[PDB]
């Protein structure tokens, strides 16, 4: 028979370097090494170097996890997808070698694809709409024309950064997100923030500046912090609702560092009841960058016959998700 087909995934687009291992029915292994810049904001050259030194130990601790023999790995999927050049080349290289070292095939995966497919996998969704909310990414994507199509998006700032550049203007350690999350709790009143949805696209610069101007005005912070969430998540809840009843589907998935917000999850599962369609809240841990979500998106590619000899492979920091054919829904 055809033995349970096993893959190993390498994620390394931004700051997270992770390696996963799965097969059709299993999730044999997976751990990451996040580059933690106490500073804050993008730090490309520093990131690659982080990786470069721990990529060694991730892919190797993993094998131990899966407790599978090294011979047992069949495919090798890395994240050639969108991201930071220094990091992508580090991952790309590392893979191009492991493929040789272990003597098996290899394919380049697209990054956000992995977020969909791993989330889709983890929940059992057949053809959902996706809410990509990571660093500088505010994406709402869906499988429509035999490929994953991006419908709406932020025209200025990824929701995640607007969040952090307020914390880093309201004097707060770069653990910005959650610090403002468990801060909007004690928010008493709702101030006014520029609500900008237009089609399925959004803008966030407006929110920020109007929020900073309120800040120096000497307003509350719990109030500002509270208002910004309800105002921006309001903007996503609308766009979502729309994305659904445009490409006509009955399911949702949240992927990203932003997607770990306790109140955002609520405002979504709530829209679920009112839309009449399932709000699969993916495993609270698979929301950040992981190597294994790569393995999952590769598995699917190879299984549908898509293959690529080593030479063809090369990073692409500008990798459109609708550039890859996804013929399996």
């Amino acid at each position: 028979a055809m033995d349970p087909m096993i893959v190993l995934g390498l994620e390394g687009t931004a700051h997270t370097i992770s390696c996963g291992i799965i097969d059709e029915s299993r999730i044999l292994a997976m751990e990451s090494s996040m580059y933690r810049p106490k500073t804050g904001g993008i730090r490309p050259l520093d990131a690659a170097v982080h990786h470069s030194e721990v990529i060694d130990t991730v892919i190797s601790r993993a094998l131990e996890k899966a407790k599978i023999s090294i011979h047992d790995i069949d495919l090798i999927g890395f994240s050639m997808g969108p991201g930071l050049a220094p990091s992508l080349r580090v991952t790309a290289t590392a893979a191009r070698t492991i493929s040789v070292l272990t003597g098996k095939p290899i394919i380049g995966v697209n990054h956000p694809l992995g977020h969909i497919e791993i989330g889709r996998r983890v929940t059992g969704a057949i053809d959902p709409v996706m809410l990509y909310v990571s660093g500088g990414n505010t994406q709402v994507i869906a499988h429509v024309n035999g490929r994953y199509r991006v419908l709406g998006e932020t025209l200025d700032i990824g929701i995640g950064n607007m969040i952090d550049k307020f914390a880093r203007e309201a004097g707060i350690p770069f653990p910005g997100g959650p610090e403002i999350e468990k801060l909007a709790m004690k928010g008493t009143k709702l101030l006014d923030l520029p609500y900008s949805v237009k089609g399925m696209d959004t803008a966030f610069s407006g929110i920020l500046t109007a929020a900073l101007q309120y800040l120096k005005t000497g307003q509350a912070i719990e109030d500002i912090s509270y208002s910004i969430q309800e105002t921006a998540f309001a903007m996503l809840v609308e766009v979502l609702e729309r994305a659904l009843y445009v490409s006509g589907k009955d399911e949702i998935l949240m992927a990203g560092g932003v997607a770990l917000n306790r109140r955002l999850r609520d405002m979504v599962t709530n829209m679920a009841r009112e839309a009449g369609i399932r709000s699969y809240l993916t495993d609270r841990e698979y929301c950040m960058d992981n190597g294994i979500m790569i393995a999952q998106a590769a598995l699917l590619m190879y299984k549908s016959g898509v293959r690529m000899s080593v030479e063809e492979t090369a990073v692409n920091p500008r990798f459109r998700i609708d550039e890859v054919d996804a013929p399996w829904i």
């Binding site: 290289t93 070698t97 040789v100 070292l101």
Partner: protein, 77 residues
């Protein structure tokens, strides 16, 4: 203009082969040079030959490649 030349020896001649290959794909991959590099394989030893305008340019290029080779090396190991 600056001038650079790096050489690192590997235990065996085949390890050299592997690392060369791995990184060679990356060499070719790059669109924009911030300097001119010459890639070569020797015995069990890879050779780098760089020509940059200033010292800030050359530096970044080195960092790249040296990071790539440490990637290949460590995987093999």
């Amino acid at each position: 203009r600056v001038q650079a030349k790096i050489e690192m020896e590997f235990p065996s001649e085949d390890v050299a082969k592997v690392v060369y290959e791995a990184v060679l794909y990356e060499h070719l991959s790059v669109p924009y040079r911030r300097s001119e590099i010459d890639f070569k394989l020797e015995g069990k030893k890879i050779i780098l030959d760089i020509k940059a305008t200033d010292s800030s340019a050359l530096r970044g290029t080195v960092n790249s490649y040296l990071r790539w080779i440490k990637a290949a090396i460590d995987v093999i190991e």
